[PDB]
Design an enzyme around this catalytic site. Sequence first.
Site, PDB file in Angstrom:
ATOM      1  N   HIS B  42      43.320  28.997  44.356  1.00  0.00           N
ATOM      2  CA  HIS B  42      44.209  28.761  43.198  1.00  0.00           C
ATOM      3  C   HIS B  42      45.657  29.165  43.518  1.00  0.00           C
ATOM      4  O   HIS B  42      46.584  28.694  42.891  1.00  0.00           O
ATOM      5  CB  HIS B  42      43.694  29.473  41.952  1.00  0.00           C
ATOM      6  CG  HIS B  42      44.042  30.925  41.894  1.00  0.00           C
ATOM      7  ND1 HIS B  42      43.132  31.918  42.186  1.00  0.00           N
ATOM      8  CD2 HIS B  42      45.198  31.550  41.576  1.00  0.00           C
ATOM      9  CE1 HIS B  42      43.718  33.096  42.057  1.00  0.00           C
ATOM     10  NE2 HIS B  42      44.972  32.901  41.682  1.00  0.00           N
ATOM     11  N   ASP B  88      36.769  29.708  44.652  1.00  0.00           N
ATOM     12  CA  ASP B  88      38.195  30.060  44.722  1.00  0.00           C
ATOM     13  C   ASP B  88      38.480  30.752  46.075  1.00  0.00           C
ATOM     14  O   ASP B  88      38.650  31.969  46.164  1.00  0.00           O
ATOM     15  CB  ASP B  88      38.601  30.918  43.527  1.00  0.00           C
ATOM     16  CG  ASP B  88      40.124  31.090  43.404  1.00  0.00           C
ATOM     17  OD1 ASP B  88      40.879  30.378  44.129  1.00  0.00           O
ATOM     18  OD2 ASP B  88      40.542  31.960  42.594  1.00  0.00           O
ATOM     19  N   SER B 185      46.159  38.382  43.088  1.00  0.00           N
ATOM     20  CA  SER B 185      45.297  37.233  43.336  1.00  0.00           C
ATOM     21  C   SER B 185      45.397  36.808  44.785  1.00  0.00           C
ATOM     22  O   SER B 185      46.512  36.743  45.330  1.00  0.00           O
ATOM     23  CB  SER B 185      45.753  36.071  42.459  1.00  0.00           C
ATOM     24  OG  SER B 185      46.069  36.546  41.165  1.00  0.00           O
ATOM     25  N   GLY B 186      44.253  36.484  45.401  1.00  0.00           N
ATOM     26  CA  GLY B 186      44.225  36.056  46.815  1.00  0.00           C
ATOM     27  C   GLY B 186      44.020  37.172  47.822  1.00  0.00           C
ATOM     28  O   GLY B 186      43.616  36.938  48.973  1.00  0.00           O
TER      29      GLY B 186
HETATM   30  C1  LIG Z   1      48.261  37.988  31.182  1.00  0.00           C
HETATM   31  S1  LIG Z   1      49.071  37.642  32.765  1.00  0.00           S
HETATM   32  O1  LIG Z   1      49.458  38.839  33.431  1.00  0.00           O
HETATM   33  O2  LIG Z   1      49.890  36.476  32.736  1.00  0.00           O
HETATM   34  N1  LIG Z   1      47.810  37.131  33.706  1.00  0.00           N
HETATM   35  C2  LIG Z   1      46.825  38.129  34.107  1.00  0.00           C
HETATM   36  C3  LIG Z   1      45.543  37.315  34.353  1.00  0.00           C
HETATM   37  C4  LIG Z   1      44.786  37.685  35.613  1.00  0.00           C
HETATM   38  O3  LIG Z   1      44.594  36.860  36.496  1.00  0.00           O
HETATM   39  N2  LIG Z   1      44.320  38.935  35.711  1.00  0.00           N
HETATM   40  C5  LIG Z   1      43.503  39.376  36.751  1.00  0.00           C
HETATM   41  C6  LIG Z   1      42.711  40.476  36.490  1.00  0.00           C
HETATM   42  C7  LIG Z   1      41.814  40.967  37.405  1.00  0.00           C
HETATM   43  C8  LIG Z   1      41.714  40.311  38.617  1.00  0.00           C
HETATM   44 CL1  LIG Z   1      40.547  40.872  39.780  1.00  0.00          CL
HETATM   45  C9  LIG Z   1      42.479  39.180  38.873  1.00  0.00           C
HETATM   46  F1  LIG Z   1      42.352  38.564  40.072  1.00  0.00           F
HETATM   47  C10 LIG Z   1      43.390  38.689  37.952  1.00  0.00           C
HETATM   48  C11 LIG Z   1      45.977  35.828  34.349  1.00  0.00           C
HETATM   49  C12 LIG Z   1      44.862  35.007  33.764  1.00  0.00           C
HETATM   50  O4  LIG Z   1      44.708  34.846  32.566  1.00  0.00           O
HETATM   51  N3  LIG Z   1      44.038  34.519  34.668  1.00  0.00           N
HETATM   52  C13 LIG Z   1      42.921  33.682  34.436  1.00  0.00           C
HETATM   53  C14 LIG Z   1      42.037  33.783  33.368  1.00  0.00           C
HETATM   54  C15 LIG Z   1      40.964  32.891  33.306  1.00  0.00           C
HETATM   55  C16 LIG Z   1      40.804  31.930  34.314  1.00  0.00           C
HETATM   56  N4  LIG Z   1      39.740  31.025  34.249  1.00  0.00           N
HETATM   57  C17 LIG Z   1      38.499  31.464  34.622  1.00  0.00           C
HETATM   58  C18 LIG Z   1      37.415  30.648  34.586  1.00  0.00           C
HETATM   59  C19 LIG Z   1      37.565  29.326  34.158  1.00  0.00           C
HETATM   60  C20 LIG Z   1      38.795  28.894  33.780  1.00  0.00           C
HETATM   61  C21 LIG Z   1      39.909  29.757  33.832  1.00  0.00           C
HETATM   62  O5  LIG Z   1      41.040  29.346  33.524  1.00  0.00           O
HETATM   63  C22 LIG Z   1      41.688  31.828  35.371  1.00  0.00           C
HETATM   64  C23 LIG Z   1      42.748  32.720  35.405  1.00  0.00           C
HETATM   65  F2  LIG Z   1      43.614  32.648  36.431  1.00  0.00           F
HETATM   66  C24 LIG Z   1      47.220  35.809  33.439  1.00  0.00           C
END
Ligand SMILES: CS(=O)(=O)N1C[C@H](C(=O)Nc2ccc(Cl)c(F)c2)[C@@H](C(=O)Nc2ccc(-n3ccccc3=O)cc2F)C1
Lengths: 44, 234
Positions: B42, B88, B185-186
Amino acid sequence: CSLDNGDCDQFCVVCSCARGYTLADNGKACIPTGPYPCGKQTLE
Amino acid sequence: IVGGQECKDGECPWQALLINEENEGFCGGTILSEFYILTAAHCLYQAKRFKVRVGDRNTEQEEGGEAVHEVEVVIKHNRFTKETYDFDIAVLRLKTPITFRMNVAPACLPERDWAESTLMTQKTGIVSGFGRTHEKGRQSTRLKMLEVPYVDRNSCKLSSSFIITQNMFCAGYDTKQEDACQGDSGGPHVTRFKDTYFVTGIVSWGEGCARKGKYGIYTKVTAFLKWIDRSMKT
Ligand SMILES: CS(=O)(=O)N1C[C@H](C(=O)Nc2ccc(Cl)c(F)c2)[C@@H](C(=O)Nc2ccc(-n3ccccc3=O)cc2F)C1
Ligand SMILES: [Ca+2]
Ligand code: NA
């Protein structure tokens, strides 16, 4: 392999190691071949 | 990284940083070898062109050991989609080989069956990166790390708005304010066995960051060990 990882330092009794490692004389420990072996934190 | 602490010198040597046209970091990666970086599929959508920086611990200061590498080949999993965030994973082949040194060294790839039985059943793993230090906040200029417990798959599915697939696993905390975040991420999720660190996950997604009742979701690297091997052989 269940008990104590077969006493293996890395992979599991038949032990083995990741790339950049040689299995030791004892057949359990793993010896790095280079100065920067995978998965080791680096020192100065 | 929300919570956690700055990585000490040499503590996170497998960390890679993908940098965009504005010379700004936007995703992490894991050094697998002198030519290959492991990252999330992604991440590839977020910047038209990007390079890879290794050896950096502070993005505001040029310190000894930082190096920049162009990417020769991007290998994105053909089944990745934004609909599900499943599969991913991507591997980057670099144009020129990385020179291993202080702060620059690969993480180990484990064997699949052993990893499933021995690594993933550990209590915790380690996540690292330069991502946001709070959900709505700025990216960190310093490399941070965080110990994250493995979280039971069923608990995670119950907590999640989205489907958790067999290519994913969960880690982190129910309510404690510690988590990976956007920008991490990544990057690497590694698990220590005895004194060796093995790459077990790729920081993938989560609902917010450090949200009460939500966990961090990681690409499960064991599911892709054959794919990685095949990608790294061309
Ligand atoms: C608020 S923010 O700061 O702007 N930010 C933090 C979130 C994040 O990535 N946190 C994060 C937290 C922990 C770890 Cl480990 C990690 F890598 C990342 C990110 C988000 O909302 N990501 C997100 C949410 C959901 C899906 N998803 C999943 C399945 C299907 C469809 C689908 O879209 C995909 C996504 F990218 C937005
Ligand atoms: Ca720097
Ligand atoms: Na949480």
